[PDB]
Write a protein that binds this ligand. Structure first.
Ligand SMILES: [Ca+2]
Ligand SMILES: [Ca+2]
Ligand SMILES: [Ca+2]
Ligand SMILES: [Cl-]
Ligand SMILES: [Cl-]
Ligand code: NA
Length: 208
């Protein structure tokens, strides 16, 4: 007769819950399970402004949906309060949700547009420009690899550091401006992503 309050029976409450950041919105991520000694019909929910922004809960079935895209690069851990109610009380428990990473970012260049003026007598070996692309993904998918695409016979860019170096004698009267495109890619062994950036190398000859 005196009501007994519901309690959760999911094990994840003791451990945690992992959701991949590429889980599309609408996907069910789990289903809350609760027990009630009175066998009252229960209603489920999620509490908290944040938790409620990213997660929705089916009140009768306790199925937990993904309401907003998860983005590990922005927030990688949630503590969410789930609620269960027999209509006489509301009981609450927090679970930790780790958002798993995916290579979902192309490298992104900084300090564009890229242009450099250099004299034609610039010696082979001279570093003339630093290119910089960042990639916020974890592991190989956030580790960037520079290259010229297509390759240049006059210039080389260091794969690790993005330092563009002159590798062959320049000749103003042949070429007075090169239009190279650099390719930054991450190194996800299976599904890499990549971005292109133009580099203007313009040659000068003051001693006509
Ligand atoms: Ca009850
Ligand atoms: Ca990436
Ligand atoms: Ca990612
Ligand atoms: Cl509980
Ligand atoms: Cl990631
Ligand atoms: Na992301």
């Amino acid at each position: 007769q005196v009501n007994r309050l519901p309690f959760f029976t999911n094990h994840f409450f003791d451990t945690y819950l992992l959701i991949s950041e590429d889980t599309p919105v609408g996907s069910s991520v789990t289903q809350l399970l609760a027990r009630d000694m009175d066998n009252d019909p229960l209603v489920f929910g999620v509490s908290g402004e944040e938790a409620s922004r990213f997660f929705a809960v089916e009140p009768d079935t306790g199925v937990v949906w993904l309401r907003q895209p998860l983005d590990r690069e922005t927030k990688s851990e949630f503590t969410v309060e789930f609620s269960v109610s027999d209509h006489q009380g509301v009981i609450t428990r927090k679970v930790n949700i780790q958002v798993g990473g995916v290579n979902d970012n192309a490298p992104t260049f900084h300090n564009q547009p890229y242009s450099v003026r250099i004299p034609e007598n610039t010696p082979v070996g001279t570093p003339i420009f630093i290119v910089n692309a960042t990639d916020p993904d974890l592991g190989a998918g956030g580790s960037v690899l520079y290259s010229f695409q297509p390759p240049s016979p006059f210039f080389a860019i260091d794969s690790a550091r993005g330092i563009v170096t002159v590798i062959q004698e320049l000749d103003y009267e042949v070429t007075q401006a090169y239009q190279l495109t650099v390719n930054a890619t991450d190194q996800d062994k299976t599904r890499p992503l990549s971005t292109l950036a133009n580099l203007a190398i313009i040659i000068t000859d003051l001693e006509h």
